[PDB]
Amino acid sequence: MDKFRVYGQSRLSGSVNISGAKNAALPILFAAILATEPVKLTNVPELKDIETTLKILRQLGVVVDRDATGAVLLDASNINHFTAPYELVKTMRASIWALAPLVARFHQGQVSLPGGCSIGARPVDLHISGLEKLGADIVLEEGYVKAQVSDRLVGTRIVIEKVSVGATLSIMMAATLAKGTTVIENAAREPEIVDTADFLNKMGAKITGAGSAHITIEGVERLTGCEHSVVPDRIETGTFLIAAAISGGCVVCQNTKADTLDAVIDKLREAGAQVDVTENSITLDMLGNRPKAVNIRTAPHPGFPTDMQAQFTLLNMVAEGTSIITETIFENRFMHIPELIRMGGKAEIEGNTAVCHGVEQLSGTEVIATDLRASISLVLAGCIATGETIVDRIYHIDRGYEHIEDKLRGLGAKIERFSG
Ligand SMILES: CC(=O)N[C@H]1[C@@H](OP(=O)(O)OP(=O)(O)OC[C@H]2O[C@@H](n3ccc(=O)[nH]c3=O)[C@H](O)[C@@H]2O)O[C@H](CO)[C@@H](O)[C@@H]1O[C@H](C)C(=O)O
Known part of the structure; x- marks a missing residue:
């Protein structure tokens, strides 16, 4: 110890x-589950949360490593597993962010439901609810949040009743591949959200309004890849x-x-x-x-x-x-x-x-x-x-x-x- x-x-x-924001790098790394082409992230801080995220990504089939320049090179072209396991999720509840992109791109995903956290009550009801609004069917079986959708997600208007950084990001990630347009009213405005949206846009997404309480996303079939320096x-x-x-x-x-x-x-x-x-x-x-x-x-x-x-x-x-x-x-x-x-x-x-x-x-x-x-x-x-x-x-x-x-x-x- x-x-x-x-x-x-x-x-x-x-x-x-x-260094780059830990909380911009984390959502960007999970949003990366959507990339069909290589990704290069610079200014990514060297800290445990990044290492934990990389472990979760690798067991989904993502190949990702920080090279000697410090840059994080990521290839998510061949994800073949769609579960973020309990053993990893329990160490960092932010891993809930793996569900949205997995579901949006592969139409299924599974993530251990985060349990208790010292600093306070931290349910993820808004994330689930938002994904359900986009058309996902979600159940909780054996401690796992299980999501599925028969077809591509569908864009619609979503008013998150509470200001939530995490839910705003889960929904935005999922919406980039939904059909039609999604609107997120009462969105959290954190700078990290603006950065993830910029990152997604560099890969073909179409998000406007990030940084404001009104985000508009026009869905696309798939995202490619890009190089991005973290805010x-x-x-x-x-x-x-x-x-x-x-x-x-x-x-x-x-x-x-x-x-x-x-x-x-x-x-x-x-x-x-x-x-x-x-x-x-x-x-x-x-x-x-x-x-x-x-x-x-x-x-x-x-x-x-x-x-x-x-x-x-x-x-x-x-x-x-x-x-x-x-x-x-x-x-x-x-x-x-x-x-x-x-x-x-x-x-x-x-x-x-x-x-x-x-x-x-x-x-x-x-x-x-x-x-x-x-x-x-x-x-x-x-x-x-x-x-x-x-x-x-x-x-x-x-x-x-x-x-x-x-x-x-x-x-x-x-x-x-x-x-x-
Ligand atoms: C990884 C990451 O970016 N984590 C950060 C993010 O947590 P987060 O959980 O996503 O942000 P919330 O959704 O804005 O929520 C804040 C409030 O909203 C309630 N809520 C949230 C979601 C939901 O579905 N239902 C619901 O009720 C919630 O219980 C709380 O009262 O935002 C917090 C506030 O700025 C930060 O303190 C936190 O940093 C931490 C330390 C860290 O780096 O480890």
Whole structure:
């Protein structure tokens, strides 16, 4: 069981390279099940989720590997198995995305129904419902969601009653091969959705409206292939900007996308940070100042993203003043707070809200990670706390961040990966 040993009390400053969005790469990799010709993906981060996805793809008959340039070369021309097995799906519920394309292209597909997840209730009822609207027959047999359709799917109007990134993507993927036109009202607008749609369009799809709540897809018989560079990861960018914001440092993020972080950038500024945005970089200079507490309310894009909530909870815990953090996406995504309280943080939780009271300095001790995106807050806390900090179960961190120790050490942190 790997752990991080972190020695704090150091301002984080310098340059860090942002990688492609983990959550654009994942849906793009599953959407790739639709490609009848070779696919080349660049800027795909090196992290566990990608590896898990590749394992799922390979057992469907997809040949895919990252070559020495770092590019991911994929050939889905001969899929001969149509089941994403329980043993793989249980490790990453996003694999639910394998069902839509399998069903749309091969008219059948089977995926283990995701079970429980720590951060909250996460059913996939909207995905199923949406696929059923396109004409799929779906049953749940022995823990497996089984889909089938006698003929090509049929495009129709679909209003997803809840804003859902995942359901918006399952439906959009399936619609690219449906007959006629599909319309997805109340679609999630996340930048990763825009990227998947762009990726699909490069293969012959016909999607317009991605990024808005109204997506239109004109179905085609089949998709070909393409080369595609994944959109920068806004969450990784946010995380490093916060690294500077919580340590009074100055950080430059390279290869960023200007407009995917407005909510986050506005809050950093509200917190007292000076942030400079160019077309391909974002620089945050905290000018050696302590942050000013800010309220936070998570919500679907373009609002403040839940994947940046813990990072900002940390900022508030060392800020000056009181703050209210409300999480509306996942009702139980506050696991970091008590771990951060072990370090000296002050916060009270009540339902989906946390009231934090900022302190001057945290102090190191041992804490446990449990959220692949949120737990990064614990590592950052180690960087600015007094003495030593030990973050256990960092394997969670490895699913959502690539070379995190290298990038952090690159900003001046003293972090070593060890075991036992
Ligand atoms: C792989 C990936 O892209 N995962 C991301 C995506 O999860 P997702 O599940 O698809 O997004 P949702 O559908 O927008 O849903 C958010 C809310 O919607 C409810 N809902 C969703 C689908 C459904 O059928 N029924 C239904 O009720 C749901 O229960 C929740 O309350 O969006 C989240 C919010 O931005 C991210 O935190 C999450 O990152 C994670 C950490 C990670 O990288 O591992």
